[PDB]
Design a protein around this ligand. Structure first.
Ligand SMILES: NC(=O)C1=CN([C@@H]2O[C@H](COP(=O)(O)OP(=O)(O)OC[C@H]3O[C@@H](n4cnc5c(N)ncnc54)[C@H](OP(=O)(O)O)[C@@H]3O)[C@@H](O)[C@H]2O)C=CC1
Ligand SMILES: NC(=O)C1=CN([C@@H]2O[C@H](COP(=O)(O)OP(=O)(O)OC[C@H]3O[C@@H](n4cnc5c(N)ncnc54)[C@H](OP(=O)(O)O)[C@@H]3O)[C@@H](O)[C@H]2O)C=CC1
Lengths: 527, 521
């Protein structure tokens, strides 16, 4: 007898893939959990049923009606959190607090869109801006609208957020009336599949609105057509491979990418060791290094501090990192669990060795015995902190990402903005999801933030006045844009209402006033 | 021995390409006009100077300051229109009225962005939407902003609009603080090069802000990097080649495509021959087939009419098309000039022959003697009107584009149950995504409803009715305050739409901070 083979949901039916499948395992205990397989699926019908029946069914509803369905899904997921936490513990090896980012982060994001969606109203098209006169006598005018794309939304998701990656994307997709096919990363696919199964079993959404495929991705892009959209999250390397596909190069399907990002944290010149902003910086660096063992795309990887502050920074980080206990998330004493897999454990350790060739290791608690875990079975890596004294000439600092509990600190020469050098150094990341900045002076934060804006999708400013209210460097608030230029993928997600454009076509309607009036009665946009 | 070799403007200097270059010719008279060449240019330097020197200089200026420079260009271009019209006549073979679409359309568009830009004020970044609270006590908030991309804008432009294609794109790009490298299509590059030369000569913009390269495209995409943007206008085939390039696939540069589009015109059930809307439809179809000899990306290619209206439609189109005189644009009696080149003449004739395999030729004035032009020299194609009786089983109708004075009429089945035009909407959709559909009715309210039905497959829906006979801006004319582009076959691109055009040239970022810091940007 073998572990459960998880079924796919395609063309409105639960269908097992054929063969022995791929086993998912517990990254702490090594226990075999479940299996996945996409072998032998009818991908043509999987895509046609979603596109035709799923799409027609969703578009038949208004925005408000679809939002009401999202609100029902929220209630359902909320009721089954107990099941989800147990899966997260086993499949991902994350502490309860860290699992919560995925599970409760996911639910929060979905609820936010349910609430926002109600404000889109009882219509089948959205109003983009206002009418513009095209005539001296105002007889002829233009009004832009958004209409749902007559395609499917294919989500190729990363291993780190099986729950949040699904709902962050599915909420604006379904709100926009676009049917979803999700393809979660294999290693941690279990939570994704269970959530989809719960939602599908509940019959909240019409048949074809939500489908799931786990296992091999072979054949998926071959089914993508010109009105479909694809949202990919993962490595820059994989993203480039996807971009070459005929689905995009020949058929022009939309593709959003979130990829590698060496996110920066900048300690401002005024934030000296004696000031409150200093402590906030130390706290934020440690949090981002350790939450999910640093396995967030937005985690701080590069921390830039004034030359004068380098030694006190390292000392403070060492002291705080020392309190981070590592091991089995089932133990209450554990502050940080495992990476997602032994494979990731290997990648991360190789990355640490690579960085070490060009950087000094200031902190490494590898020798500390794991709590309730066997170091030889678990995918636990202890926090590692590097120092790069010459970031201008550094060969790896600005280029090599270690997707684990690892970051590098580098001094900058204080100067124009005092932080001008740090801004240039951040820019060397070649485009990032987020930069955070730390100062005692709220009047200083704006100018610095604008200097970072063209190279960072989000700039997150932490200061004493917001010690209790700031929402976290790495946490993605759904009302704010997520994504970044250059290496980070050039993508955009979330940002509240901004998320809808990806799922719509914008059209200019030019017509007599009375025609603009009648088309306008059939649209809505929030005040 | 020898026509003028036009110089490129790269890295702030005028540099001739090497070799004999490529000759541009008058498509009516066959006269050699000028030559272009990009041979031996230092492309690395051209792109670095634009990105670094040009980009830094533009970004140092505020939106309003850049808008003010745009306004100066407008005045300059206006003062030199006489030069531009003579070039358009010779190089493009277009009538004065058709040349005006390119020249005065270009100027209008630039001036529109100059005005829009003045309103943006003395700032270096734009607010996107309003500030939003991220905490119960409102101490922590978020404001989205737009910042200019630290790259260059490369425009690979189509032959049809050397002026408008330039200013179309260059206006929002320069307003956004992004340096421009224009690469106009060879055959008609002269007007583009002259406009760029006049602007450069005048020193309105900083060195590096505006560059031009004419001749071979070899090596251009190789210079494109991750913060650059590229705007291509032309064939789907070429677009597909561009999309495959490492500049986009590996380095992730932005690419906007506007490509082949089988734009529809739909005659509504109510628009019978005895109604004023019927003549508006006839007039618009004829205008779109003949303006620039049908060489607009937006021209009507497929005209869908109720089964009952088909014969009156064909007869009315025949009568109107008969009035369209063809020949030398220098002659004031000529209503329609030449295609842009003898090569295009052959391409269009091939296209006509292809369509004829599956369609009946209802009108063809090929044998009507040209005015002041030699049929063996000139690239004059006469209007051709096809009829496809069964558009449901038609292959070529919905797929094959002829970039000339050529369209196809087809009947639709009116729906008598509960829109009358349902079948026509389905037929328009068969074009697989288009720039524009026009719709024609006596009933303004009905048009609003029908428009919404066409919106997901057309970038623009343009409704013509008696109430706007005098004010409607034309099926094919691209008003800069409205979005230009379309889904699917049309390329999935978006241009213009007033301030909407700026997004392409900026990065949007969420700033989350203490509310005080948010308030003052
Ligand atoms: N040196 C390294 O290896 C480094 C890795 N990373 C991290 O690797 C993580 C991704 O895990 P993954 O295998 O390892 O990497 P990729 O980014 O593929 O992972 C993203 C998703 O794409 C899917 N995918 C992968 N290849 C293809 C393909 N050819 N066609 C269609 N879909 C595909 C994967 O599915 P499935 O998982 O089922 O294979 C995965 O779920 C990323 O989150 C990234 O941050 C970060 C830094 C360095
Ligand atoms: N069956 C037919 O007759 C068809 C005709 N067409 C017509 O084709 C017209 C456009 O073609 P036409 O101008 O001759 O020229 P083509 O599209 O070949 O080329 C147009 C522009 O794109 C450039 N280009 C081509 N390949 C690349 C590349 N790999 N990298 C960078 N730039 C490149 C060309 O540069 P360069 O100077 O180096 O060539 C030129 O500047 C369309 O407007 C349409 O009317 C479209 C489809 C079918």
């Amino acid at each position: 007898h073998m572990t459960e083979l998880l079924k796919n949901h395609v063309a409105g039916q639960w269908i097992a893939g054929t063969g022995a499948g791929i086993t998912l395992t517990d990254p702490v205990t090594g226990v075999a959990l479940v299996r996945v397989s996409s072998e032998g699926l009818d991908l043509a019908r999987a895509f046609s049923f979603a596109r035709e029946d799923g799409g027609a069914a969703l578009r038949a509803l208004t925005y408000a009606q679809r939002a009401a369905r999202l609100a029902d899904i929220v209630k359902l997921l909320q009721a089954k959190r107990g099941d989800y936490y147990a899966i997260a513990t086993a499949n991902s090896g994350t502490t309860r607090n860290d699992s919560a980012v995925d599970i409760d982060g996911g639910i929060f994001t979905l609820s936010y869109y349910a609430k926002l969606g109600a404000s889109l109203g009882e219509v089948h098209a959205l109003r983009d801006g206002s009418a513009e006169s095209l005539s001296k006598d105002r007889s002829f005018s233009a009004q832009h609208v958004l209409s749902p794309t007559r395609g499917v939304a294919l989500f190729i998701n990363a291993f780190n957020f099986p729950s949040w990656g699904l709902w962050e994307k599915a909420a604006p997709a379904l709100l926009s009336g676009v049917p979803v096919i999700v393809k979660p990363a294999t290693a941690t696919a279990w939570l994704t599949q269970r959530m989809v199964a719960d939602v599908v079993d509940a019959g909240i959404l019409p048949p074809g609105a939500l489908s799931i495929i786990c296992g091999s991705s072979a054949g998926l892009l071959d089914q993508i057509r010109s009105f479909d959209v694809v949202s990919f999250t993962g490595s820059a390397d994989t993203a480039a491979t996807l971009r070459a596909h005929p689905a995009f190069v020949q058929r022009g399907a939309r593709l959003n990418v979130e990829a590698d990002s060496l996110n920066s944290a900048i300690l401002c010149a005024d934030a000296t060791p004696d000031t409150p902003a200093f402590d906030l910086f130390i706290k934020e660096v440690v949090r981002e290094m350790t939450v999910k063992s640093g396995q967030k795309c937005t985690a701080i990887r590069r921390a830039f501090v004034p030359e004068a502050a380098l030694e006190p920074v390292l000392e403070a980080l060492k002291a705080k990192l020392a309190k981070i206990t590592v091991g089995n998330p089932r133990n209450d004493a554990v502050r940080m669990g495992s990476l997602v897999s032994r494979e990731q454990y290997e990648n991360v350790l190789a990355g640490i060795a690579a960085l070490r060739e060009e950087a000094v290791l200031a902190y490494d608690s590898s020798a500390v015995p794991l709590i309730d875990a066997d170091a030889n079975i678990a995918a636990c890596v202890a926090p590692h902190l590097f120092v790069v004294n010459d970031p201008d000439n550094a060969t790896l600092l600005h280029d090599v990402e270690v997707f684990g509990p690892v970051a590098s600190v580098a001094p900058y020469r204080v100067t124009a903005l005092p932080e001008a050098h740090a801004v240039a150094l951040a820019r060397r990341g070649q485009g990032s999801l987020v930069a955070s900045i730390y100062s005692n002076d709220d009047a200083h934060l704006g100018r610095l933030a604008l200097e970072l804006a063209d190279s960072h999708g989000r700039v997150h400013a932490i200061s004493p006045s917001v010690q209790h209210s700031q929402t976290g460097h790495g946490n993605v608030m759904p009302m704010s844009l997520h994504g970044g230029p250059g290496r980070a993928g050039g993508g955009e997600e979330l940002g509240g209402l901004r998320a809808l454009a990806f799922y719509h076509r914008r059209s200019a309607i030019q017509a007599a006033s009375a025609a603009i009036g009648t088309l306008t009665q059939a649209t809505h946009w929030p005040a």
